[PDB]
Amino acid sequence: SCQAVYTPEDFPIPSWWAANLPVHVLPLARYNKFKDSQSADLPEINGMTHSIAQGMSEETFEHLRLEQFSQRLDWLHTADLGFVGYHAEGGYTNGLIQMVSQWKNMAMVMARPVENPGSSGIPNVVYVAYSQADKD
Amino acid sequence: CQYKIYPPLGIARVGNGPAIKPLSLSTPEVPWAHLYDTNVQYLVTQQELEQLLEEAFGGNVINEISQIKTKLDERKFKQEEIETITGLLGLSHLVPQQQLSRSLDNLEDIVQQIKGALLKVLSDHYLHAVKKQAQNFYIYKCDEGNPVEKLKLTDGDKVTWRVEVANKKSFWYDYNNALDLSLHTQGSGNLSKNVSKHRLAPAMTAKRRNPNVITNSLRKQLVISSQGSVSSDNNTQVPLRGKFPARHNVLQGSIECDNEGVLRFYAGNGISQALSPSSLNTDAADNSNWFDDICDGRVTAVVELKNGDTFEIQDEQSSAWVATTPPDYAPQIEPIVTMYDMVSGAALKEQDLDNLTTQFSDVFPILYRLYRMQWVNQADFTDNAVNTQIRELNSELGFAQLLDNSASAKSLREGIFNQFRNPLFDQDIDVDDPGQSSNEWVSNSRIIPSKDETNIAAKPATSSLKLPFYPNDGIDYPGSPVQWFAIPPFMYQHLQNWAAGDFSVTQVEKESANTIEELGLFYSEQFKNSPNSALLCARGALDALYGGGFHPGVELTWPMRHNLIYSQNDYVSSVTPEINLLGLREFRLKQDLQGLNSPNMYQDFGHVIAVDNVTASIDPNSDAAWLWRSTPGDLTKWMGIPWQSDAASCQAVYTPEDFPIPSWWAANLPVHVLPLARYNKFKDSQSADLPEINGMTHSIAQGMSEETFEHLRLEQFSQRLDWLHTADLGFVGYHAEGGYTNGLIQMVSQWKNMAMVMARPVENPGSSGIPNVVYVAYSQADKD
Amino acid sequence: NLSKNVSKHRLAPAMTAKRRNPNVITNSLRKQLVISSQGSVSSDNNTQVPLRGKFPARHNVLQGSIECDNEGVLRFYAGNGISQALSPSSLNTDAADNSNWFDDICDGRVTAVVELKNG
Amino acid sequence: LLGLREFRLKQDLQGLNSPNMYQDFGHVIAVDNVTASIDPNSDAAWLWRSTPGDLTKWMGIPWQSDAA
Amino acid sequence: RHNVLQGSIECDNEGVLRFYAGNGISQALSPSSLNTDAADNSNWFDDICDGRVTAVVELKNG
Ligand SMILES: [Mg+2]
Ligand SMILES: [Mg+2]
Ligand code: NA
């Protein structure tokens, strides 16, 4: 129950206690799509094949990094709180019921490095939410 | 055949805006006309209502109020004075007279206080309203039966249109899944025979909606129908109004004819309702006790030349059909596969797709439409590798490499082709229990689970999830490859010929193909300049409609993917001599020429419908063949009742894995959008001449470095919002429940307030990476 | 037991039926959904033998018990009537088809061998 | 008094070890699977030759739901 | 927006007032607002009422 309280106006979204029970987080999946520099020596760079990552302009590469960095995920969606599957009900009360088993699977936010942010605007330290649902 | 109606299947969409030309829209008559048009207004605007007030306020009305003004001035406008003023205003069509008088009686420039009280009433009714998308129908003179010219009337000539529509949703059967999924077939361009043959998504039996109404005679009360006629001798609009049961008036549409003989058809106001207030519409498609104002019916006409020669436009080769649908909430975002593509695929035999020939313009719509899904679907913005690779190519003006059919581009082409799901549904599977009655093709890719959980560990996926990331007709069946959407066999065939290099393309296209947008603009001009307006109009009516998946869908559903439902379905030509662009076709619906009077108007199959009835319907002398000879109401009866429930059901289907997020029909019911609030935080350059720049004070925006300013813009541009949160769908307030069912219930009132996606300009993106044209979702909740 | 009129005149058409626990895929894994057990008793020993299985095949499911008396009569006891969901939050809201649940109901094959004094 | 009869169920003599112990008909069962089961040589006839669990597998799960 | 008939009154020629209550109509402002609580349901109105009854007697002589 310690999450967002939505108003008729969309923004800003009110949140209760987000420092200890987060509301919108940067998941590991997005971290893995902006942490690498374009020069990286890997068959996959920021979730792209080496060939595609190296072939685009540097400006576009850094733009894709910042787009990924900006996708924040509802913390309630970092585990199955009853919204998963075809015609799943979701909703407030199912979250309460499912949190009794799912609390131990919710994303844990941890500081992580970005070795070469370059031109991208992404800070050298980012705070990344780790869970199994959000990891890839 | 001397005269035919076009389009053969017209489409009109509900909306609560008025049914007048300046405040309504038109179904496209030319594909891709306005994809980047940043002046579009799909919601009724203040400016539009102001100009409509002004026009009604001629100098005629000024002097009348002055004459009034001198009398009351003798001695509140009394009454009779009021009735005079409203009379000269000619607004009693748009809003009820009582309300006009009402606003004039509390009053005390008094033109400017009348011309201000009336604006309040007009705005309370129509400001921000979802404009109606009306269909124009045209009579073309044909040679021999090619349509050559629009009919041109002369003095003494007259056209008379007739329309008969119905809604049978409440009379028909539950929609559980598409019955043709078990229909034996040789395979078509729309549906591989593998689906039925290997039992990939078996058709379910379906019981009746409103099952407590028994006997055919009494179930007739469950059908809403109406009819009208208009002619070129009279401008007046005529309502198509029914009753349910056949207590409530239901406005199914409105028709008008202008002096040139053009029929304009408007859909209803989007009003859905239960017979009792406590019957809530908790199911996605099958809610008893409900009716909505969707409809479809038969469009015919008669031409009378002054000579006295009279031509009946009444047979199926010449007649037309109309269907009404939910609004299109992103008119410039095209479904990846459209209802037009279903018409094209219906006439093809799967086994012969070997002999199809492919131009690059047959393949480009797949890549273009999917690329543009980024404005309505998160997965196609941030989790789609093909769209990322297109962006890469655009960033180096290298898009034209994709148009290269030579061996040195083959690995580039195959890399993209291989990410697409094959509608044979025979990839990424393992055959379970071969030869047994439990014989099954089980996907080794990611599955979409049922909501009914089992605490047994899922089987790890070994194959990658193929594109697009959308659910499909077989969603009900965890492990079926048909849980996920595949472009249809004939379109996959084009893409496969593209990958192999068996395709042609003109040099002229290559020179316009440095970015995908430049090529998209070029193809749009090819449609503009194409001479066959009749056939472009037939195509434009359906190229905005979804063509899969069918569960049941958004506008129409699976019967349209069978040649059996057409009386005629013939390829005519490429869009250009040199450029096919998927082709122009002459098609016609198989119609029951008796319309509302047909002995099969109220036919059914008893307590259930099942695939056996469809199987029997293939014999045209059987007692089941009426299924394909449409009477009014037959195209829309399959869909959800009320449509709002199915719209609210047409969003994301979450998997245990967060990304990518699977989305149903996002091109017409968006899932993740870019709201007005974010547009106002990135549209401005740091040089903008405004006291507030992208939501910051002028001083703060100029104070930051140029780099940081551009970054903040791209951060805002990247913030996408769940479309369901663009209005109050039950999640608003302290401890609001939210959730799936509350969205179904609330959508019946809130559909008219959901965000509407419109192309908007960015005048100076600088080096921000934001395109010059963006697609922005407007709603009152998401506006700041 | 059943007049042909019911099928002939379509009086109550059979409906199709989907799988229970539909998220378990492949026949190999669906075997986990089956609870089974077996045992033997003979007239030479009074001791009662439990017929105890597992679900998935984590929880012990007593499907019944069997004894044989010295005259050679088999007595078969059913389970304790224990039904349970694999997680407490899964409620059995449907009259017949509830995923994630098991019960101790069973049925199966009864055989015997009779061994006489001589051989 | 309605009489006395000698009756016996069709049995799979391998019981738990039968190759049809875990048979099914794929994503759905329908009457057509029952119609094909009538032919004793079809790959659907196992529906009538019971292995353990076949008599009760039809019933409500859990049984207490159906009782209520 | 909604007309609510709270009652009806008549008086016979002997000066007896008759007061009828409403038709028993209760309704929410939106059909989807269900009255799931015994007493406290927002968005609802009903046609119950209560109020003040007075009169004036005018005799022949004035
Ligand atoms: Mg903290
Ligand atoms: Mg659209
Ligand atoms: Na080459």
Which structure tokens are listed for B277?
Answer: 């207030």
Q: How far is A121 from chain B (nearest CA, A)?
A: 6
Q: How was this structure determined?
A: X-ray
Q: What is the enclosing helix (H) or strand (E) of B209? A: none
CA of B718 to the centre of ligand 1 (A): 26
Q: How many residues does chain D have?
A: 68
DSSP letter at B565?
A: G
**Which residues lie below 8 Å from residue B472, measured CB to CB, with a gap of 6+?**
B482, B483, B484, B485, B486, B548, B549, B551
The two three-digit tokens of residue B264, written as one number: 């304009």
Q: Do B456 and C12 touch (CB under 8 A)?
A: no
- Cβ of residue C21 closer than 8 Å to a chain D Cβ: no
Name the token pair of B320: 């037309």
Residue D3, min C-alpha distance to chain B (Å): 38
Binding-site annotation, residues of B: 328, 330, 333, 667-668
CA distance B618 to chain D (A): 20
Nearest to B319 by CA among B534, B139, B158: B139
Beta bridge partners of E61: none
The alpha carbon of B545 and the centre of ligand 2 are apart by a number of angstroms equal to 8
- Interface list for B 270-289 with A (CB within 8 A): 284
Residue B218 contacts residue B190 (beta carbons within 8 Å): no
**Chain B environment of D27 (Cβ under 8 Å):** 199-202, 440, 477, 480
> First and final CA of chain A: distance in angstroms?
27
**Ligand 2 centre from B334 Cα, in Å?**
5
Tell me the nearest-neighbour CA distance from B326 into chain A, angstroms. 21
Q: Which of C80, E9, C24, A16 is nearest to B455 (CA)?
A: C24
Cβ A97–C87 below 8 Å, yes or no?
no
Residue ranges of the alpha helices (H) in B127-251?
Answer: 194-197, 216-219
Interface of B with A in 368-427 (CB under 8 A): 378, 381-382, 385, 388-389, 391-392, 395-396, 398
Flag if C20 and D61 touch (Cβ within 8 Å): yes
Which residues partner with B310 through β-bridges?
B304
Identify residue D17 by its one-letter amino acid code. Answer: N
Sequence length of chain A is 136
Q: Is B509 helix (H, G, I), strand (E, B) or coil?
A: helix
The shortest C-alpha distance from B496 to chain A (Å) reads 22
Given CB atoms, is B735 within the 8 Å cutoff of chain E?
no
Chain D hits for B435, CB-CB cut-off 8 Å, are 43
B609-to-B176, B185, B625, C14 alpha-carbon distances in Å: 11, 19, 14, 11
**Alpha helical stretches, state H, B608-705:** 611-617, 643-648, 676-679, 698-703
Rg (C-alpha) for chain A, rounded Å, is: 17
Among the partner-chain residues A52, A71, A121, the one whose CB lies closest to the CB of B388 is A52
> B264 CA to middle of ligand 2, Å?
22
Q: Distance (Å, rounded) from C-alpha B469 to C-alpha C119?
A: 71
Cα A19 to middle of ligand 1, angstroms:
4
Kind plus residue range of the DSSP H or E element containing E61: none
DSSP B464: P
* DSSP summary character for residue B188: B
Cis previous bond, B31, omega within 30 = no
The residues in C 40-79 lying below 8 A from B, measured between CB atoms, are 56
User: Which residue does chain B place closest to C94, by CA atoms?
Assistant: B452
Q: Hey, are the CB atoms on B437 and D27 less than 8 Å from each other?
A: no
User: Length of chain C, please?
Assistant: 119
Give strand pairing partners of B265: B135, B255
Chain C residues with CB-CB distance to A100 below 8 A: 89
A17 CA to middle of ligand 1, Å? 9
- Contact between B508 and B361 (Cβ < 8 Å): no
Distance from CA of A91 to the nearest CA of B (A): 4
Q: Is D24 on the interface with B (CB under 8 A)?
A: yes
Burial class, A101, CB count within 10 angstroms (exposed 0-12 / middle 13-18 / buried 19+): middle
Parallel/antiparallel/unpaired status of strands A73-74 and A24-25 = antiparallel
Q: What is the DSSP secondary-structure string of B325-387?
A: E---S-TTS--SSBHHHHHHHHT-BGGGGGG---BHHHHHHHHHHHHHGGGT-HHHHHS-HHH
Chain C nearest CA to D41, separation (Å): 23
List chain B residues with CB under 8 Å of A11: 677, 782, 784
B658, B673, B735, B741: best to mutate for the A interface, most A CBs within 10 A: B658
Chains in contact with D, where contact means 3 or more Cβ–Cβ distances below 8 Å, are: B, C
Q: How does strand B320-325 pair with strand B9-13? A: parallel
E strand or H helix that includes residue B572: strand B566-573
Contact A100 C89 (CB under 8 A): yes
**A19 labelled as ligand-binding?**
yes
Asked whether the beta carbons of residue B280 and residue E27 sit closer than 8 angstroms, the reply is no
- Ligand 1 midpoint to CA A15 (Å): 14
Contact (Cβ atoms closer than 8 angstroms) between residue B267 and residue B324: yes
Report the first-to-last Cα separation within chain B, whole angstroms.
57
Ligand 1 mean position to B162 CA, how many Å?
A: 69
CA neighbor of B631 nearest in space, from B294, B320, B296, B209: B296
CA of C47 relative to ligand 1 center, distance in Å: 61
Asked if D touches A (at least 3 Cβ pairs < 8 angstroms), the answer reads: no
C-alpha distances in Å from residue C38, one per residue of B298, C35, C59, C109? 68, 11, 17, 10
Q: Cβ separation of D52 and C31 shorter than 8 Å?
A: no
In chain D, what residues touch B436 (CB-CB under 8 Å)? 23, 43
Q: Give me the long-range contacts of B504-509 (CB less than 8 A, separation at least 24).
A: B504/B357, B504/B358, B504/B359, B504/B360, B504/B405, B505/B359, B505/B360, B505/B361, B505/B403, B505/B405, B506/B578, B506/B579, B508/B578, B509/B360, B509/B361, B509/B403, B509/B579
Any chain A CB within 8 A of the CB of C87?
Answer: yes
Report the C-alpha gap between B470 and B482 in whole angstroms: 11
CA nearest E21: which of E46, E45, E42, E56? E46
Q: Resolution of this entry in Å?
A: 2.0
For residue B478 the two structure tokens come to 């965890």
What is the Cα–Cα distance from E27 to E5, expressed in whole angstroms?
Answer: 12
The C-alpha angle B259, B260, B263, rounded to 5 degrees, equals 85
For residues B80, B81, B87, B89, the Cα torsion angle rounded to the nearest 10 degrees is -150
Pick from B113, B75, B118, B115: which is nearest to B96 by CA? B118
Contact (CB<8Å) D16/C31: no
CB contact, 8 Å: B706 with chain A? no
CB-based contact B456 C27, cutoff 8 Å:
no
Minimum-distance CB partner of B478 among C16, C25, C27:
C25
CA distance B171 to chain C (A): 19
Instruction: Tell me the C-alpha distance between A94 and C116, whole Å.
Output: 64
